[PDB]
Scaffold this active site. Structure first.
Site, PDB file in Angstrom:
ATOM      1  N   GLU A  28       2.686  -0.626   6.198  1.00  0.00           N
ATOM      2  CA  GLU A  28       2.891  -0.989   4.787  1.00  0.00           C
ATOM      3  C   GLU A  28       1.634  -0.719   3.955  1.00  0.00           C
ATOM      4  OE1 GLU A  28       5.367  -1.546   2.845  1.00  0.00           O
ATOM      5  OE2 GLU A  28       4.087  -2.024   1.131  1.00  0.00           O
ATOM      6  N   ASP A  59      -8.683   4.667   2.104  1.00  0.00           N
ATOM      7  CA  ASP A  59      -8.302   5.943   1.469  1.00  0.00           C
ATOM      8  C   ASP A  59      -9.340   6.382   0.428  1.00  0.00           C
ATOM      9  OD1 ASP A  59      -7.631   4.615  -1.035  1.00  0.00           O
ATOM     10  OD2 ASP A  59      -5.614   4.249  -0.287  1.00  0.00           O
ATOM     11  N   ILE A  80      -0.945  -7.090  -7.728  1.00  0.00           N
ATOM     12  CA  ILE A  80      -0.386  -6.202  -6.695  1.00  0.00           C
ATOM     13  C   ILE A  80      -0.528  -6.806  -5.286  1.00  0.00           C
ATOM     14  CG2 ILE A  80      -0.619  -3.939  -5.557  1.00  0.00           C
ATOM     15  CD1 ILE A  80       0.791  -3.679  -8.169  1.00  0.00           C
TER      16      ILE A  80
END
Ligand SMILES: O=C(O)C(=O)Nc1ccc2nc(NC(=O)c3cc(Br)c(Br)[nH]3)sc2c1
Length: 360
Positions: A28, A59, A80
């Site tokens: 996820e 990332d 978020i």
């Protein structure tokens, strides 16, 4: 709403005992990194299984927006990371600790969580020239009981198939427990997926059939190649989520596969010369295939998503295969003649075996 995930964790992330849910925590967080890679910012993702039973996903994207949310009051990242849309808030809620580190402008923003709740607000720890998002989570042993330690081969197999399923994206998997390392950067896509599946096998023809089309809102990407063996191996996907038990997409694939090959064999005169009628089972023998479909609002049999039941996807996959597989067969006659030659032999052997049963 917020505490509903900790109560019923298997509902949001899947089985919390057999290891499915625990490894789905990593996927996820990886999927969110991959979604940024689909945006065109993230060229590399670095999954790291740390020594203290924790996984991180670094990332090199633009970063999670630090922009301060006016309605909530807290940062856009905290929204978020907590408010549900699976979502990363599920991964945050089911973790004893979660280290969020966002490199955005030229400011390393950091935030620690514990059981979903932030220990403090998002704050600029230092400066940086680089840009990206790093999320390192410690999964809660209150949630995840039996399978507690992360497993390299499970993360390896899925991150590798995610690299195939996301054309040109780099995924690095590192295991600091034993120094085990991999780098998945399969630029070929689902075409290279077929090569990987056939790398130890012996392909009977060189040109791998491929397409990537979009009809009536439904994306259909299929890549297949026969081998000398007699095993069917069709790997089916819906929004990069695998389907173990197949589905409508698999049905439409098989539907078009049979029609097209029969239509070719009858038209070119292979069935007439052979004196034999070929079925799907013969065409299926020795087949390796990938069917990656992209559906906006798909329906599955259960929350496991092992079978797709969106009836629109069958008709989408069937007609697209039927045009392009037929286009492939004419444009690649040496491949067609080799493939048809195997199918006739399989049809001859079956009908002779069935004829052998009846005849004494
Ligand atoms: O066009 C833009 O200006 C823009 O860049 N918008 C934007 C908005 C939201 C947003 N959220 C992201 N999160 C991630 O990439 C991520 C999550 C995890 Br967990 C990990 Br690991 N990586 S990138 C991102 C970009």
């Amino acid at each position: 709403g917020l505490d509903a995930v900790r109560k019923r964790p298997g509902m949001y992330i899947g089985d919390t005992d057999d290891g499915t849910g625990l490894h789905h925590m990593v996927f996820e967080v990886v999927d969110n990194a991959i979604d940024e890679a689909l945006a065109g910012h993230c060229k590399e993702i670095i999954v790291t299984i740390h020594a203290d039973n924790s996984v991180s996903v670094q990332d090199d994207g633009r970063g999670i927006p630090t922009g301060i949310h006016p309605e909530e009051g807290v940062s856009a990242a905290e929204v978020i990371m907590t408010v549900l849309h699976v979502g990363v808030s599920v991964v945050n809620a089911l973790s004893q600790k979660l280290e969020l580190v966002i490199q955005r402008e030229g400011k390393i923003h950091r935030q620690i969580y514990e059981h979903g709740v932030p220990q403090a607000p998002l704050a600029v720890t230092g400066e940086t020239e680089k840009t990206g998002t790093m999320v390192r989570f410690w999964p809660s042993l209150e949630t995840f009981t039996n399978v507690t330690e992360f497993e390299y081969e499970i993360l390896a197999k899925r991150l590798r198939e995610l690299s195939f399923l996301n054309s040109g994206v780099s995924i690095r998997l590192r295991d600091k427990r034993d120094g085990k390392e991999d780098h998945f950067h399969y630029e070929g896509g689902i075409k290279a997926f077929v090569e990987y599946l056939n790398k130890n096998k012996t392909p009977i023809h060189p040109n791998i059939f491929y397409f990537s089309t979009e009809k009536d809102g439904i994306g259909v990407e299929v890549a297949l190649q026969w081998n000398d063996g007699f095993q069917e191996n069709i790997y089916c996907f819906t929004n990069n989520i695998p389907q173990r038990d197949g589905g409508t997409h698999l049905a439409g694939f098989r539907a078009a596969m049979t029609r097209t090959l029969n239509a070719y064999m009858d038209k070119e005169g292979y069935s007439k010369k052979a004196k034999v009628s070929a079925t799907g089972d013969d065409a299926r023998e020795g087949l390796i295939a990938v069917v990656s479909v992209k559906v906006p609002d798909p329906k599955f049999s259960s929350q496991t998503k092992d079978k797709l039941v969106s009836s629109e996807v069958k008709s989408a996959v069937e007609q697209q295969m039927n045009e392009l597989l037929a286009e492939y067969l004419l444009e690649n006659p040496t491949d067609a003649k080799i493939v048809v030659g195997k199918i006739i032999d399989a049809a001859r052997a079956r009908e002779a075996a069935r004829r052998a049963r009846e005849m004494t």
